[PDB]
Paper text:
To test whether agarose could be used to deliver crystals of large, multi-protein complexes, phycocyanin (PC) was chosen as a model system. PC is a cyanobacterial antennae protein, part of the light-harvesting complex, which channels excitation energy to PSII, subsequently driving charge separation across the thylakoid membrane, the membrane that contains PSI and PSII. The PC complex forms a disc-like trimer in which each monomer is composed of two subunits, α and β.
Numbering used by the authors:
A (entry chain A), D (entry chain A), F (entry chain A): 1 to 140, 143 to 150, 161 to 174
B (entry chain B), C (entry chain B), E (entry chain B): 1 to 72, 75 to 174
The structure:
């Protein structure tokens, strides 16, 4: 998995050398940043239930039909409303994972890879998920570098969906 | 591979769960303690040659049969390989220290090493000694009070010892 | 690989014998019946996406644990792989239909698939269900009376079912 | 083995795609041709014994010494007369196999591959076999597309021997 | 690989010892006897085609089932392969003669040959006959008194026979 | 291992052919040379103990400190004096091996490969060993082609050390 640290170790390793100073300097760099992105992560973790729920409704609002429409891909049914709640949950969880690791690695590996293919195969429109993301981006309730770090991982996600 | 952060994410992803407050605290302590970790890698790294040379002097002193003709370290090219192996293993250990996770070491170095040496007829037991000798050398160097700001690095040294011991086991 | 014709030639070559009148008749019936075979491949092919999507919807409906976190189809990249696997297997089946022989399927796809999934810890039983669901979908589509000239394709559908069942067995 | 059908499947497979329409069109093409080449094949199969015998003698004629000459490679001996009868049999059998498969595949695989090497190693002159082929080509007794298809596989063989 | 000289050096290096007077004498006799060795390689080499052809005629005469349809030497391409195999094995034997050591043969040819033929379902026993037939042919040709200066090459012929027998064993 | 003979067999083998005449001519060539280089080898073998001892002292002379100096790499200690005696022994033994094989093969494989790395790692200066070599080169007591062959393998060694 791709983090700042593994990226460094990877460079050294593919050149068969011990770690360089610049590599060490990079990890220090990462440690300096870890502070803020970690308090963002646990922030997001603590009022996630808020954020998820909030997010769903907000999508539902923006795209009314999802409440009503013949379709397993639609949150018309209550089964689907679950699925969607779950999907949103998954998205939030990932931005925290990114904050924790200090890069997109976990989202790249657990969500972005195969995202096209899955959205396509299952009639899941990206707009649904991009709205949910903008919503969370608004109300995470973060200020400071912590918000910077969070909104960064979010925008990354929004891109992938477009 | 994984670092201490990714490990926890990986353990979390698979239960499908967010990180518990415990977990956040753990990683923060790691981060807090990060200067020590960095010093340890820098120090062991900067003395890699020495660690290797002196552990090899030691091992061959204790196990002369390796350099008796026929011995698995007789001839200069086998000697070189041995030394190279020791530097390799030292190098993957630094990686693991820097990551706070044994996975790099494990995956890219320990995996199927026993079997390789067995094939070769390199005595795994002897490798594992060479490893142990470097450990003791590297701990000492890493944990040197001189030229560094005083503080307790003992937990870090135990971690470090862990990786070395782990490597020794993978081939004994 | 082999097609129905080459198979018979191969069976013949090895007894060192010419084809019996029976054999000639068999292949001629195949040829005669060839439009059906072509329709079947065209139809299953043209709906490949659908077959795959709907069998996957089905399987996961029946086997939710696959998409419970930790499940062998949790994460989008594993989901993609799964879907890809299903399309692969569907694709080699069309090949076998078109050839009238399972060899392409066998050789280039089923061979050592069980072992691969076992390695991966993909539940072979579950693959074999995904296969069965596609079979039923593909038979239905292939054997649709609409938009086609009426005639009996039942022998062809059994052949087709054969290949799907064969694939399901290779991994259960 | 190379037939029209396997050649198509091979194209799709090496490009990792489902079969194309042109590929389907090719197999249809093959099916249209199968009719004639199949009745040629069973024709040749039914008076092969005729044709083989006939063929041998015809070679013997053209190359008298083969009846008499110190040599295991020669049909002087009766052992060798067998071998030669057998060899001819093999050649005929293959053109039928080709007619059945709808290409040179079976002859390419069971006869042409290694033909040089074998003729060389065993002092088997190609002329012997090219005569036998011209003979069969004359008297297969085929007319129509059936003869076309047969003579095609035969000429292919004759080439290989030169 | 090794030649007779390198073999002795290798055996010596590993005891860490210089060569005994015995050893020096052995190699000198080899050198002394070198024209014979050279003639033997030249002769077997120059008739390689013949050796191969006639041993193959022989084997198939004794073992017709190999060329019965279905037989492991039926079809021209399998026949070619067989012949090729025989030339291969003959060729690595010449190498070993020229070196005075079986190692080239061993390492680059006999190693894991049994297993290959087994996989293929080539009857190893039959290969081993083909080998034996070439041996007898090649000995005869090598040891022909005509066109060569009279002297005793019998020790050389035994060596040669050795390599052939060694190859026959590696696949029976 | 690289000898004249294996080098030939290697050429043929990598081209998948039987040995050529030039290859045969090369081995003959080697056999012609074997005579002298073999009597050199057994010469060197017979008064090696002389030569080794002689060699050590001669190094000791040229580099006095090796007799006295805190260091496991130094023959100050008697342990080290052994090691050094042994090392010299190893060098002599190799030139004989070369004479026997008719090339540098054995020295390339048992000594030259890894020589840099080892000298470096163990604080073994090349000068020590180059002196020992010049000494042996002087007093092997060989004349004729035998000396030629010997001094050849020696100079080869001396190069490697510079
Ligand atoms: C156990 C390892 C020993 C110990 C370590 C220790 N270090 C500090 C402080 C620092 N270490 C560094 C080193 C780096 N920062 C980087 O970016 C890089 C990459 C080139 C390196 C190598 C720095 C800058 C500091 C702070 C400055 C300083 O020297 O004080 C401490 C203080 C506590 C802390 O975590 O900062 C300690 C305890 N100290 C010992 O006594 C052990 C033998
Ligand atoms: C079982 C599969 C169903 C069935 C099939 C069926 N088809 C025909 C006739 C035809 N099928 C084709 C299709 C093709 N010819 C080609 O070259 C290609 C490649 C692009 C294709 C796809 C054609 C041209 C015909 C003849 C024209 C026609 O539509 O009639 C029959 C008639 C019998 C026969 O073998 O020709 C049948 C029975 N029919 C069913 O009811 C099944 C659901
Ligand atoms: C057993 C093999 C038979 C035998 C051999 C034999 N040969 C000699 C002498 C010679 N052989 C050669 C051949 C070569 N020298 C080369 O450099 C090359 C590479 C092209 C070859 C092939 C030569 C030149 C000689 C010397 C000249 C000559 O022909 O006399 C002997 C004599 C003893 C010796 O070792 O020289 C013998 C016995 N002789 C037999 O009867 C065996 C059937
Ligand atoms: C003598 C001229 C000087 C001397 C020698 C010395 N060497 C060591 C250690 C080593 N010598 C070698 C050399 C080889 N080992 C091989 O297998 C081969 C090829 C066959 C060679 C050439 C090696 C590898 C070592 C290190 C391992 C070992 O001890 O065998 C020492 C002790 C080194 C130590 O640091 O403990 C000594 C004293 N040293 C001098 O000062 C002499 C001028
Ligand atoms: C040293 C204390 C002991 C010893 C070592 C020795 N090893 C070889 C050969 C090999 N060692 C390895 C190990 C690795 N290669 C890698 O890339 C990695 C990291 C993933 C490792 C850990 C391998 C693969 C080999 C075989 C390939 C090679 O030689 O490079 C030798 C030489 C074996 C030979 O005869 O060729 C030696 C001497 N030997 C001892 O006696 C010590 C106890
Ligand atoms: C909510 C915004 C909208 C909604 C959601 C919905 N999704 C499905 C099915 C799936 N959702 C995913 C997403 C993931 N699975 C993973 O493992 C990961 C990475 C951790 C992600 C992002 C997937 C793969 C599926 C298909 C398999 C599954 O069901 O889990 C449904 C049901 C789909 C069906 O066709 O049966 C629904 C309803 N749908 C809406 O309309 C909301 C606006
Ligand atoms: C789907 C219903 C089930 C499932 C599938 C799954 N597979 C993987 C990994 C692989 N699948 C294959 C299969 C093939 N590759 C080919 O080229 C061919 C044709 C010859 C086949 C049949 C292979 C080789 C792999 C490993 C390599 C790869 O991933 O591409 C995964 C991901 C495994 C992982 O964690 O990496 C999955 C998810 N999984 C389920 O849960 C279903 C029951
Ligand atoms: C008849 C026209 C002339 C004749 C024939 C002859 N052949 C042999 C030996 C062989 N014939 C073949 C041919 C094939 N074997 C296969 O498997 C295939 C493909 C299916 C073919 C085409 C081969 C390989 C041989 C050698 C092995 C064998 O005997 O089967 C002989 C005996 C050869 C000998 O030297 O002992 C003869 C007589 N020979 C003539 O003169 C006729 C004009
Ligand atoms: C001949 C008397 C018997 C026999 C031989 C036969 N072999 C094959 C296939 C192979 N033979 C080899 C052997 C080697 N390849 C090398 O490079 C070397 C030197 C290191 C050797 C010794 C191999 C590897 C194969 C498989 C690969 C290939 O075919 O080239 C065949 C054909 C097998 C097939 O059906 O493809 C045959 C016929 N067969 C007999 O019946 C004899 C008893």
């Amino acid at each position: 998995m791709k983090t700042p640290i593994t990226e460094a170790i990877a460079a050294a390793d593919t050149q068969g050398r011990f770690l360089s100073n610049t590599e060490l300097q990079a990890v220090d760099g990462r440690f300096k940043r870890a502070v803020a992105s970690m308090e963002a992560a646990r922030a997001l973790t603590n009022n996630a239930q808020s954020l998820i729920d909030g997010a769903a409704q907000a999508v539902y609002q923006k795209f009314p039909y999802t409440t009503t429409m013949q379709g397993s891909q639609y949150a018309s049914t209550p089964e689907g409303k679950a699925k969607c709640a779950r999907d949103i949950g998954y998205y939030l969880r990932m931005i925290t994972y990114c904050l924790v690791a200090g890069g997109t690695g976990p989202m790249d590996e657990y969500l972005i890879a195969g995202l096209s293919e899955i959205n396509s195969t299952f009639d899941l429109s990206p707009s649904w998920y991009i709205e949910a993301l903008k919503y969370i981006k608004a109300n995470h309730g973060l200020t400071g570098q912590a918000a910077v770090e969070a909104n960064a991982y979010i925008d990354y996600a929004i891109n992938a969906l477009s | 591979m994984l670092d201490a952060f990714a490990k926890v994410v990986a353990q979390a992803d698979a239960r499908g769960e967010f990180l518990t407050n415990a977990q956040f605290d753990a990683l923060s302590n790691l981060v807090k303690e990060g200067n020590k970790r960095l010093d340890a890698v820098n120090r062991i790294t900067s003395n890699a040659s020495t660690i290797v040379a002196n552990a090899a002097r030691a091992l061959f002193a204790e196990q002369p049969q390796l350099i008796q003709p026929g011995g698995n370290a007789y001839t200069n090219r086998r000697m070189a390989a041995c030394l190279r192996d020791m530097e390799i293993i030292l190098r993957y250990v630094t990686y693991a220290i820097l990551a706070g996770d044994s996975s790099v070491l494990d995956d890219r170095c320990l995996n199927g090493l026993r079997e390789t040496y067995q094939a070769l007829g390199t005595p795994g037991s002897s490798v594992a000694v060479a490893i142990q000798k470097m450990k003791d050398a590297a701990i000492a160097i890493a944990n040197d009070p001189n030229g560094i700001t005083p503080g307790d690095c003992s937990a870090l040294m135990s971690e470090i010892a862990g990786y070395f011991d782990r490597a020794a086991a993978a081939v004994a």
